[PDB]
């Protein structure tokens, strides 16, 4: 029977962060770079949500997905707290990291592989060389460089 709606959360969890930042008029705008990655992870997840045959996502499979949603839940969670101009700064003050999703970047990866096993065994996909790789956290530093200026520009009208 499977849960059904539960699976949907797996995908929505990703888009949620993409749309969440889209509205936020703060540094979150840069998150678009990190979101673009996760957005591609849910791509294949949607195909399963609606296939050309009565699917049967056992619990064993749902387990992995459940771990993925956890990664996205955090990404959006931290952002929600940065909704306040005073909060976003208050955190950064004790964050000691220009990047907001520095650790989250890895989390989404550690949890992603969890599904890669089911996607490679079922979907028969590589799920690794395409998205995953070696340069991930470093890429953030690139965009972060601009984020710093975003705080300065605030001064001028
Ligand atoms: C508060 N404090 C911040 C920031 C920020 O964006 N960056 C890059 C920082 O380094 N620090 C210390 N914010 C959020 O920006 C304030 C928005 O006001 C317009």
UniProtKB/Swiss-Prot annotation:
Location of region: N-terminal bundle and brace (NBB): 5-152
PTM annotation: Phosphorylation by RIPK3 induces a conformational switch that is required for necroptosis. It also induces homotrimerization and localization to the plasma membrane.
Site description Target of necrosulfonamide inhibitor, residues in chain: 89
Coiled-coil stretches noted in the UniProt entry, renumbered to this chain: 58-87
Location(s) in or outside the cell: Cytoplasm; Cell membrane; Nucleus
Residues with PTM Phosphoserine: 128
Effect of residue 89 to S: Abolishes binding to necrosulfonamide inhibitor
Domain of life: Eukaryota
Family according to the record: Belongs to the protein kinase superfamily.
Miscellaneous remark of the record: Interaction with RIPK3 is species specific: human MLKL only interacts with human RIPK3 and not mouse RIPK3.
Function: Pseudokinase that plays a key role in TNF-induced necroptosis, a programmed cell death process. Does not have protein kinase activity. Activated following phosphorylation by RIPK3, leading to homotrimerization, localization to the plasma membrane and execution of programmed necrosis characterized by calcium influx and plasma membrane damage.
Subunit structure: Homooligomer. Homotrimer; forms homotrimers on necroptosis induction. Upon TNF-induced necrosis, forms in complex with PGAM5, RIPK1 and RIPK3. Within this complex, may play a role in the proper targeting of RIPK1-RIPK3 to its downstream effector PGAM5. Interacts with RIPK3; the interaction is direct and promotes its phosphorylation and subsequent activation.
Domain notes: Upon phosphorylation by RIPK3, undergoes an active conformation. The coiled coil region 2 is responsible for homotrimerization.
Protein name, per record: Mixed lineage kinase domain-like protein
Source species of the chain: Homo sapiens (Human)
Lineage of the organism: Eukaryota, Metazoa, Chordata, Craniata, Vertebrata
């Amino acid at each position: 029977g499977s849960p059904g709606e539960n699976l949907k959360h797996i995908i929505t969890l990703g888009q949620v962060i993409h749309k969440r930042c889209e509205e936020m008029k703060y540094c979150k705008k840069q998150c678009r770079r990190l979101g673009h990655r996760v957005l591609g992870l849910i791509k294949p997840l949607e195909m399963l949500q609606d296939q050309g045959k009565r699917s049967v996502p056992s619990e064993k499979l749902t387990t992995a997905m459940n771990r993925f949603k956890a990664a996205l839940e955090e990404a959006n969670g931290e952002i929600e707290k940065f909704s306040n101009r005073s909060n976003i700064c208050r955190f950064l003050t004790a964050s000691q990291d220009k990047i907001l999703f520095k650790d989250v970047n890895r989390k989404l990866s550690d949890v992603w592989k969890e599904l890669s096993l089911l996607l490679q065994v079922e979907q028969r996909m590589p799920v690794s060389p395409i998205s995953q790789g070696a340069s991930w956290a470093q890429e953030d530093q690139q965009d972060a460089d601009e984020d710093r200026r975003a705080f300065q520009m605030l001064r001028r009208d």
